[PDB]
Amino acid sequence: PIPGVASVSPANGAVVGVAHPVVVTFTTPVTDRRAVERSIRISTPHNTTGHFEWVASNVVRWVPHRYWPPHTRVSVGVQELTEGFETGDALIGVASISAHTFTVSRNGEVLRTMPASLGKPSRPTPIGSFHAMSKERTVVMDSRTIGIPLNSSDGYLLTAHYAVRVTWSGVYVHSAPWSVNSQGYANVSHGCINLSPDNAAWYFDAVTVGDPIEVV
Active site residues: 174, 192
Q: What is the DSSP letter of 203?
A: H
Please tell me whether 57 is known to bind a ligand.
Answer: no
CB 130 within 8 A of CB 212: yes
- 112 phi and psi angles, rounded to 5 deg: -155, 145
Report angle CA 184, 190, 192 to the nearest 5 degrees: 60
Please tell me whether 156 is known to bind a ligand.
Answer: yes
CB 117 within 8 A of CB 186: yes
Please tell me whether 203 is known to bind a ligand.
Answer: no
Q: Which residue from 123, 125, 117, 167 is spatially nearest to 143, judged by alpha carbons?
A: 123
Please tell me whether 190 is known to bind a ligand.
Answer: yes
Please tell me whether 187 is known to bind a ligand.
Answer: no
Q: Which DSSP string do the residues of 27-69 spell out, in sequence order?
A: SS--S-HHHHHHHEEEE-TT---EEEEEEETTEEEEEETT-PP
CB-count exposure of residue 45 (10 Å: 0-12, 13-18, 19+): exposed
3-state secondary structure (DSSP) of residue 8: strand
Please tell me whether 185 is known to bind a ligand.
Answer: no
Please tell me whether 155 is known to bind a ligand.
Answer: no
- 101 phi and psi angles, rounded to 5 deg: -130, 150
Binding-site sequence positions for substrate: 156, 169-170, 194
Residues annotated in a binding site for imipenem: 174, 190, 192, 194
User: Which residues define the annotated binding site?
Assistant: 156, 169-170, 174, 190, 192, 194
